[PDB]
């Protein structure tokens, strides 16, 4: 819980990138997409509704780790 509450730009880019690849590979979409044919556009819509099934594991330099849910982290 020591690590920053705000999601970093690097974290957002990877979460969207993995989610888009998962959606492009026929994963379930939780946003009821309306007229979207591009996986990256669908992934960004999921992040806005805070419904992405991914947990970010933040590894401290010593080797200890803390897991933050994508929904829990504040998105700027």
């Amino acid at each position: 819980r020591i690590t920053t509450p705000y999601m970093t730009k690097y974290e957002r880019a990877r979460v969207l990138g993995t989610r888009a690849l998962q959606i492009a590979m026929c994963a379930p979409v939780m946003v009821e997409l309306e007229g979207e044919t591009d996986p990256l556009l669908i992934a960004m819509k999921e992040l806005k509704a805070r419904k992405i099934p991914i947990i970010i594991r933040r590894y401290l330099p010593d080797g200890s780790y803390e897991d933050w849910g994508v929904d829990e982290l504040i998105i700027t």
């Binding site: 730009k9 690097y10 880019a13 990877r14 990138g17």
Partner: protein, 49 residues
């Protein structure tokens, strides 16, 4: 290959590499400089290396 006559393609130099590091773009640097150039597989023996 090297150029327009040979339908060569374009170079990601040592300076463009330095730009992409400063963005923290680890997967794009892997896509550009491995996957879309010279991706390969080797058999490695874990005993003798």
């Amino acid at each position: 290959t090297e150029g327009r006559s040979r339908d060569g393609g374009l170079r990601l130099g040592e300076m463009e590499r330095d730009c992409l590091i400063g963005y923290g773009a680890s997967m794009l640097l892997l896509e550009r400089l491995m996957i879309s150039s010279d991706a390969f597989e080797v058999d490695v023996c874990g005993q003798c290396g």
